[PDB]
């Protein structure tokens, strides 16, 4: 019956700044026998398993940088990270072990950085895909910041929005950028009717869209 709740849901901090986040328990976690609060913090970096940081509310696991400090008692806990590094990008979970175990809902820490324009590349469909009746055109928009970006696809100069799938990465753990992939899928018969295939990226870094294109006649 122990409810764990974390605050904020998410936030972003620039490298070198302080981060503080909260963990509340619906009942005290202070065990009276041992005089310790049974509250641990775990860090879960994008694509990895959770890693133990802090336990008994304030004991920092060996190998954990001293920039991480757990504090609090009873029903209220805090994790502070001083001089945050790009590598600290993660979801942070608190977890009680007073009565069985229960995790909080997590705090997503993002890293704020300087605005950066994407590096855009476009790719025609492979001969092997075309042999099978389909045609996917791929556009990568790499290493940009902030995450918000617009991509339009133009075929023979006319926008086309149907048949498009977009995917963003998690933020990068070393450069704090995002990347995005955009895939336009057409029939082979439709693909063979048009010449110019264009991916256009509009990001806050420039008023000019970044335009990458290929012509089928030049393939």
């Amino acid at each position: 019956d122990i409810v764990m709740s974390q605050s904020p849901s998410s936030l972003a901090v620039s490298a070198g700044e302080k981060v503080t986040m909260s963990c509340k328990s619906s009942q005290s976690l202070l065990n009276s026998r041992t005089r310790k609060n049974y509250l641990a913090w775990y860090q879960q970096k994008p694509g990895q398993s959770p890693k133990l940081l802090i336990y008994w509310a304030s004991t920092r696991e060996s190998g954990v940088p001293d920039r991480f400090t757990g504090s609090g008692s009873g029903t209220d806990f805090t994790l502070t990270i001083t001089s945050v590094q790009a590598e600290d990008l993660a979801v942070y979970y608190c977890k009680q072990s007073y009565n069985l175990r229960t995790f909080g809902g997590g705090t997503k820490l993002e890293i704020k950085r300087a605005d950066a324009a994407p590096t855009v590349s476009i790719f025609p469909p492979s001969s092997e895909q075309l042999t099978s009746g389909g045609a996917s055109v791929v556009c990568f928009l790499n290493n940009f910041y902030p995450k918000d970006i617009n991509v339009k696809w133009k075929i023979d100069g006319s926008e086309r929005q149907n048949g498009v799938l977009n995917s963003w990465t998690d933020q990068d753990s070393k450069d704090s950028t995002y990347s995005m992939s955009s895939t336009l899928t057409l029939t082979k018969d439709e693909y063979e009717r048009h010449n110019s295939y264009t991916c256009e990226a509009t990001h806050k870094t420039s008023t000019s869209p970044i335009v990458k294109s290929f012509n089928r006649n030049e393939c």
Binding site: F140, N142, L165, S167, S179, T183
Partner: peptide
């Protein structure tokens, strides 16, 4: 390397990966 999270469409997933 960037490997992009898979997106589900018509009950199939598609992903891509770039390398520079």
């Amino acid at each position: 390397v960037h490997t992009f999270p898979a997106v589900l469409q018509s009950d199939l997933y598609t992903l891509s990966s770039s390398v520079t």
